[PDB]
Structures are given as structure tokens and as C-alpha cells.
Amino acid sequence: SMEQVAMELRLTELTRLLRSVLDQLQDKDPARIFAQPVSLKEVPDYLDHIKHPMDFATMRKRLEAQGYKNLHEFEEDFDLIIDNCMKYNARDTVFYRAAVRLRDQGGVVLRQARREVDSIG
Incomplete structure (x- = not known):
């Protein structure tokens, strides 16, 4: 149907918008602490x-x-990154501190992103 194409055109454009958002957030992790998953070879006990x-x-x-x-599904994954970090690593570590900084800086981008999704639909 043409109705399924129009939903797919909208998902596609959401994907267009989120790829910009992700890039912008990842720029706020210049150290690339959160660029890849935590290695289970290097942190075997991690899933515990x-x-x-x-x-x-x-x-x-x-x-x-x-x-x-939607955006909320995308926000949940971003917050995992931060929230997983701040549990595993202690307050006085470079990892914990990197997350605190990504959260604070990330929130500004997301504030505007919420406004663009509502506006654009």
C-alpha cells in the first residue's frame, strides 16, 4: 500500500534525524570511552x-x-550508556567522570532534538 510507504518515508526521515543526533553526542566523548562495547575478554565479570x-x-x-x-527508544539506549558506567565505575575515576560530562552535554542536544521531532512530526 501507499499508506505503508508513507510510514516508511517517516521512519526513514526519523533515522535521518537520529544519525545527526548520534554524531553530535559521540562528539562529546572525544576520549572514545563509550565508542565500543565493554570487552568480556578484558572484563570477564561485567555481565554479573x-x-x-x-x-x-x-x-x-x-x-x-x-x-x-521513536526518540524515546533512542534516549533509553543513550542513558544505558551513562547509567551502566556510573554504577560499574567509582565516583573518583576517569570513566565515571566522563559519563557525568557526556550526560550534562548530551542533554542540550536532546532538549532540541525533542523539539524537532514534535515540530517535524
């Missing part, structure tokens, strides 16, 4: 601590497979 790991490469795979049906 973190039940739902998340990273930017995993978000990017899902993104190009038009897997985010």
Missing part, C-alpha cells in the same frame, strides 16, 4: 554487574537497521 550493556557502535548498528521507532 551490568544486565543491559550499551555503547555507540551498538546504537549505530541499530540505527542503520531503522530499529528506533
Whole structure:
């Protein structure tokens, strides 16, 4: 149907918008602490601590497979990244601090992104 094409055209454009958003957020992790998943060879015990790991490469795979049906699904994954970090790593570490900074800076981009999705539909 033409009605299915118009939903697909909208998902496609959402995907267009989110790819910009992801790039912008990943620019706020210049150290690339969150660029890839946590290695289970290097942190074997990790899944005993973190039940739902998340990273930017995993978000990017899902993104190009038009897997985010809305902005809230995308926000949940971003917040995993931050929230998983701040549980695993202690307050006085470079990892924890990197997340705090990504959260604060990330929120500004997301504030406007919410406004563009509502506006554009």
C-alpha cells in the first residue's frame, strides 16, 4: 500500500534525524570511552554487574537497521550508556567522570532534538 510507504518515508526521515543526533553526542566523548562495547575478554565479570550493556557502535548498528521507532527508544539506549558506567565505575575515576560530562552535554542536544521531532512530526 501507499499508506505503508508513507510510514516508511517517516521512519526513514526519523533515522535521518537520529544519525545527526548520534554524531553530535559521540562528539562529546572525544576520549572514545563509550565508542565500543565493554570487552568480556578484558572484563570477564561485567555481565554479573551490568544486565543491559550499551555503547555507540551498538546504537549505530541499530540505527542503520531503522530499529528506533521513536526518540524515546533512542534516549533509553543513550542513558544505558551513562547509567551502566556510573554504577560499574567509582565516583573518583576517569570513566565515571566522563559519563557525568557526556550526560550534562548530551542533554542540550536532546532538549532540541525533542523539539524537532514534535515540530517535524
